[PDB]
Design a protein around this ligand. Structure first.
Ligand code: FDA
Ligand code: EBS
Ligand SMILES: *[C@@H]1O[C@H](CO)[C@@H](O[C@@H]2O[C@H](CO)[C@@H](O)[C@H](O)[C@H]2NC(C)=O)[C@H](O)[C@H]1NC(C)=O
Ligand code: NAG
Ligand code: NAG
Ligand code: NAG
Ligand code: NAG
Ligand code: NAG
Ligand code: CL
Ligand code: MG
Ligand code: MG
Length: 584
């Protein structure tokens, strides 16, 4: 018997387990599908980045109707630490109105103001050296970055010279320097905060900062390489879980909690635990013979990610060195690795293929001459057209509320809808942060070893292509600006300066967009039950007691930014919520 059982030892689950076990009278068992990492260089060393070491095996999408019926491999972590163990270490908060919007969907206690203290509590910022801050244009607001919390973050101690050309080009096309992208707005260019521990220039993943740091505690239990296969109930009270070996041996074990079960199994894991447990849409559960404990049509609905596009380039005059020097110049690569091994300096402090700066933009910043035409098209179109006919009416109502919030964001000069990056080598990246499209993740069987059906539904809402085409065009402005023209860039096939119309551009984007950056969210959404929600503002699953969702399944919709910083802070927040109820 334990006080709490947590299903999934990723960012959210380890953060919560750490905080709960600060009380020696509280025992927690974290059951995690994947193993402990081995401190491999591909995990700890940014320049050695090997995220494939711990991908969840055997996940594939359905044919994507919005992307020429392409099927894609599905990327998500299977390891203690979850996504933090294998992600690109990009550490960014959302914008103020993300959290304010979640509140306004009917979630008391949710706002930028209520999240800020948890962002600060989550982390310790280590400032860069003064010379690098000056040379690099690295700025921050120390008043809103944490100084005492467990997640270490800082910056690489080096930048590739081409990053200077790109910064100045971005400024030339209306992306100015941002004082601090952690301050609730990020309109322009800034250094990428990185979840690195500057004492060793190694990854600060949740395994380290929310397990190893406190692993002397006897009340903090971990069971790697096991799957939570089912929640156990006494009436409507969640009292325990069943678990099985991840490797598929015909063993099943029950373990019980005295206070609560917490799901932390991620956007693609949490809904499957709920549905196998009889918490989910009665149509699906009836088809599979699963007895209904709580009829929640929102479970597995509302899937979101943040699509990506890689644009290939050739250069007549690129500057040396650059990220591609690591792969095409054995001498350079060896010298940089030796430099890192000796004094922890140089290119190996940057995640492999990343540069050091990035840019974020609102819809009006991307599309100053046409954003009102995009907003009009989106306003004109019934929210129901984005979902299959016969979608549960409560789920449609919640989608319409999300959509109305996002259209306000499209009007807001201080909320981002897209990200631009250049690694300094042969490609650029353009990310779509705020899709209106919604996907699904549903079990196909009662067998807990079976992958769910994963349908991103990328590009099914036609507004998304209008936003994404605008982001593409802004990226093209950067590469055509004076400070980048000196390097002699040109788009390579299948892009090219000869694609000038929205139709010509998007035809290629439809063939190249990746549905996912492994940012899967929002499949157990925090909205009122009558809006298709799965959890309350206190993250309690509707219709049962003693059961919460901690992982980013609970988010209503995607942020202006990537999820990691908010995955940590939301778990810090929930730990205090749980402590308040049980007087811990
Ligand atoms: C390769 C890659 C790259 C990036 C990113 C991810 C990935 C995989 N992300 C996304 C970010 O890392 C991600 O959104 C968060 O880790 C989500 O945290 P959660 O706690 O929701 O899930 P998370 O995925 O962290 O943890 C879920 C855990 O549950 C486990 N699990 C699932 N089913 C289970 C079951 N039935 N029983 C037990 N355990 C189960 C999984 O094994 C996993 O460890 C990212 N974000 C960002 O901000 N910056 C970035 O640079 C990147 N880059
Ligand atoms: C560094 C760039 N980058 C990513 N690369 N992903 C990579 S790199 C990579 C190389 C190999 S290889 O070595 O076999 O070729 C295989 C798979 C890889 N993957 C797939 C996971 S994921 C990401 C997210 C964010 S965000 O979260 O901030 O948006 C920002 C930047 C990101
Ligand atoms: C990562 O953050 C932690 C927490 O703020 C740092 O740990 C503190 O470090 C100081 C100086 O070494 C110690 O005196 C404190 O006792 C530590 N506190 C805790 C709670 O651990 C660590 O220093 C950080 N890494 C860097 C590079 O600053
Ligand atoms: C995708 O497949 C459907 C069949 O389900 C077909 O009707 C449609 O034409 C296909 N789309 C493309 C672009 O090939
Ligand atoms: C920093 O900003 C200044 C002023 O715009 C510019 O001259 C310089 O090239 C920039 N350097 C980098 C590395 O971004
Ligand atoms: C698992 O074990 C039980 C009890 O021995 C048995 O009834 C069942 O056939 C086994 N299943 C598999 C997949 O081997
Ligand atoms: C390879 O890198 C080395 C070490 O920095 C440098 O001296 C050399 O000029 C590079 N070679 C090419 C062809 O860029
Ligand atoms: C357009 O440019 C691309 C990119 O270099 C090239 O592949 C193609 O030859 C050009 N297209 C036509 C129709 O001439
Ligand atoms: Cl292990
Ligand atoms: Mg210093
Ligand atoms: Mg050494």
């Amino acid at each position: 018997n334990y006080t709490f059982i947590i299903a999934g030892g990723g960012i959210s689950g380890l953060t919560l387990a750490d905080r709960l076990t600060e009380d020696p009278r509280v025992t927690v068992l974290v059951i995690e599908a994947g193993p402990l990492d081995r401190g491999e260089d591909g995990i700890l060393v940014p320049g050695a980045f090997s995220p494939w070491l711990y991908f969840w095996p055997g996940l594939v999408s359905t044919p994507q109707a919005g992307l020429n019926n392409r099927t894609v491999d599905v990327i998500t972590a299977q390891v203690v630490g979850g996504g933090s163990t294998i992600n690109a270490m990009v550490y960014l908060r959302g914008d103020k109105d993300d959290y304010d919007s979640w509140g306004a969907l009917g979630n008391p206690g949710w706002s930028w103001n209520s999240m800020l203290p948890y962002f600060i509590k989550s982390e310790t910022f280590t400032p860069p050296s003064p010379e690098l801050a000056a040379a690099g244009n690295i700025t921050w607001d120390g008043s809103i970055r944490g100084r005492s919390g467990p997640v270490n973050y800082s910056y690489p101690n080096y930048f590739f010279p081409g990053s200077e050309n790109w910064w100045n080009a971005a400024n030339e096309v209306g992306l100015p320097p941002v004082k601090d992208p952690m301050a609730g707005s990020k309109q322009g260019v800034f250094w990428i905060p990185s979840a690195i521990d500057a004492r060793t220039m190694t990854r600060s993943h949740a395994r380290r900062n929310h397990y190893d740091r406190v692993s002397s505690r006897p009340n903090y239990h971990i069971l790697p390489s096991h799957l939570v296969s089912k929640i156990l109930f006494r009436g409507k009270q969640a009292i325990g879980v069943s678990y099985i070996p991840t490797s598929g041996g015909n063993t099943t074990t029950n373990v019980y909690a005295s206070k609560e079960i917490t799901l932390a199994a991620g956007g693609l894991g949490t809904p499957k635990i709920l549905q196998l447990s009889g918490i989910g849409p009665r149509k699906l559960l009836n088809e599979l013979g699963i007895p209904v404990i709580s009829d929640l049509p929102g479970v597995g609905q509302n899937l979101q990610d943040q699509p990506t596009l890689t644009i290939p380039y050739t250069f007549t005059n690129n500057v040396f060195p650059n990220t591609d020097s690591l792969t095409t110049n054995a001498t350079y690569n060896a010298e940089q690795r030796a430099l890192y091994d000796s004094s922890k300096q140089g290119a190996y402090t940057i995640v492999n293929s990343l540069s050091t700066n990035i840019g974020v933009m609102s819809l009006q910043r991307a599309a100053p001459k046409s954003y009102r035409q995009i907003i009009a098209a989106a306003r004109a179109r019934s929210a129901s057209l984005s979902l299959p006919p016969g979608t549960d009416p409560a789920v449609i109502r919640g989608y319409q509320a999300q959509r109305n919030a996002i259209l306000k964001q499209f009007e807001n000069p201080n909320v981002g809808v897209g990200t631009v990056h250049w690694g300094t080598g042969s490609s650029a990246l353009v990310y779509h942060l705020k899709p209106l499209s919604r996907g699904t993740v549903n079990i196909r069987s009662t067998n807990p070893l079976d992958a769910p059906e994963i349908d991103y539904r990328t590009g099914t809402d036609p507004i998304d292509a209008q936003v994404y085409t605008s982001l593409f065009r802004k990226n093209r402005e950067i590469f055509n600006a004076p400070s980048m023209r000196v390097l002699g860039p040109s788009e390579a096939a299948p892009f090219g300066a000869n694609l000038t119309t929205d139709e010509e551009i998007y035809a290629v984007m439809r063939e190249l967009i990746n549905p996912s950056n492994a940012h899967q969210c929002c499949t157990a959404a925090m909205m009122p039950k009558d809006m298709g929600g799965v959890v309350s503002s206190e993250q309690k699953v509707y219709g049962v007691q003693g059961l919460r969702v901690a992982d980013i399944s609970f988010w209503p919709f995607q942020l202006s930014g990537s999820p990691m910083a908010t995955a940590y802070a939301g778990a810090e927040r929930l730990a205090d919520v749980i402590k308040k109820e049980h007087r811990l």
